[PDB]
Amino acid sequence: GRKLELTKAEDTQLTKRVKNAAANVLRETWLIYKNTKLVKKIDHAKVRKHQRKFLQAIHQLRSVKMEQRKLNDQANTLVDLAKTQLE
Amino acid sequence: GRKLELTKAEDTQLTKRVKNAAANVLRETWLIYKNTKLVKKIDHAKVRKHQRKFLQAIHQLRSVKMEQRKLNDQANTLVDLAKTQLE
Amino acid sequence: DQLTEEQIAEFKEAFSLFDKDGDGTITTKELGTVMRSLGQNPTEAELQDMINEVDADGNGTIDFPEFLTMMARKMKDTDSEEEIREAFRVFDKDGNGYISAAELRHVMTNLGEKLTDEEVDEMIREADIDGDGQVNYEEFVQMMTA
Amino acid sequence: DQLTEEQIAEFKEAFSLFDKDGDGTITTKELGTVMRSLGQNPTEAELQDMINEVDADGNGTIDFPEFLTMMARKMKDTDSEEEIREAFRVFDKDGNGYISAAELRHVMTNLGEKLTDEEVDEMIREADIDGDGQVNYEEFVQMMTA
């Protein structure tokens, strides 16, 4: 039987969260780059502002990824339960 | 400056969840093993029962681990925000 | 993702674990009850997401072929050795690879659902390979998952 | 975990980002407001956990030395190249390593906070290294994180 083995691992709301956050990672990556490497005179207030927006976007994408992993393991729990009947 | 870099990654309620779930992983690992390898006559009703309890315990530990990772990234978000002031 | 006949029948029994009122359909409400019985706490949105993933016709609930069709995509299993080792490591107070027979009995008779002191005797008889009153839990777990 | 003088001063400015009412203390309530302003949604228990981790004296709130003492443990940073590449990959419709200049403009002028068509012109001027109207986003991200 399956003994101690378990299912091997690996929405629209989350999908919207991903596209908006990802676009903002692109936005703020670009604007930090521009303001730190393509200017004659770095404006730190500008860099700080875009660093705040960059970290928020990156952490939004991490949040989505973590939620996906959680959802995947919740579904795998249900598949594992169903598989007990294979015994 | 820090440019595009971010903080490098890696409770009592969760602690109790961990010890109880971990003890149950040990419990059910043992009982599945016994009932599949140390008996003359496998009782599948017994194996199914302990497979259900095993998967629940394993998935409880996964749940705690995921929550820890989420908490860690929430704290890292706050550290990242604070670090914008270093610019 | 191709399922046998015998597995189709066993998964019908499985469906009854989920379809609590046996009305032929699994709802978010039944799924919540089941997930909580397994010691998890999915949110409303997570329950709806789990249904929406296997909800072919968009009627809000899961039927048997959505349920079966879906098992087919996830029949692959993998060994649990490392996860089980990590569960033992929780009780490895000094992080030395060992848990004493005494500490194992103490854990198993107080935490979780528990074993009787006599069930623990059988477990320790197998676990303490060297008869030194110490359990090398990496080795024990490897033995049980072999 | 040793902090300089200048960094201690800059982190005082940081504390004001969190201490919304400037009463000298950060509460779970202020932390919720801040986390939500950053587009996250921590639960009550998560907020209490975040406080309890840096809450040295157990009075339920974070003060400046709990806040500072705590930054010291996490000053290490790491590069974000791979995470940034993965953000671009979201818009790589055909999974071929490329996003066209046209599709990039379309994304950047419609999704998220947005760039002006003119800001996009500057971004594409840098991104389209080969002048072929296509962005190899792995290369562009490597350039920006160099």
Ligand SMILES: CCn1c(=O)[nH]c2ccccc21
């Ligand atoms: C077939 C097992 N299963 C999932 O994978 N997701 C589910 C959602 C509801 C019920 C069972 C589920």
Ligand SMILES: CCn1c(=O)[nH]c2ccccc21
């Ligand atoms: C010093 C940054 N920080 C954490 O690491 N956890 C926090 C909880 C509340 C406020 C700031 C926090």
Ligand SMILES: [Ca+2]
């Ligand atoms: Ca039903």
Ligand SMILES: [Ca+2]
């Ligand atoms: Ca359906």
Ligand SMILES: [Ca+2]
């Ligand atoms: Ca305050």
Ligand SMILES: [Ca+2]
């Ligand atoms: Ca405190």
